[PDB]
Design brief:
- The PDB classes it as immunoglobulin binding protein.
- It is a single chain.
- The chain is of the alpha+beta class and about 55 residues long.
- It has one domain: Ubiquitin-like (UB roll), CATH 3.10.20.10.
- Helices cover about 25% and strands about 45% of the residues.
- The longest helix is centred in the middle third of the chain and has 14 residues.
- It is globular and about 30 Å long.
């Protein structure tokens, strides 16, 4: 299943997607990706659109 991430950091902004079997797996890879790119914010997840968001 395709999941999306909306990045609204101070420095990195945009959207990316990933394929994952479920939501906890997609949250795992999105968190590592955010952390590798120095983004550190509040997170939300909406299962009706399969979209994560991180805001700094």
């Amino acid at each position: 299943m395709t999941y999306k991430l909306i990045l609204n950091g101070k420095t990195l902004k945009g959207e990316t997607t990933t394929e994952a079997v479920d939501a906890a797996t997609a949250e795992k890879v999105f968190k590592q990706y955010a952390n590798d790119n120095g983004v550190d914010g509040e997170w939300t997840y909406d299962d009706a659109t399969k979209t994560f968001t991180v805001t700094e």
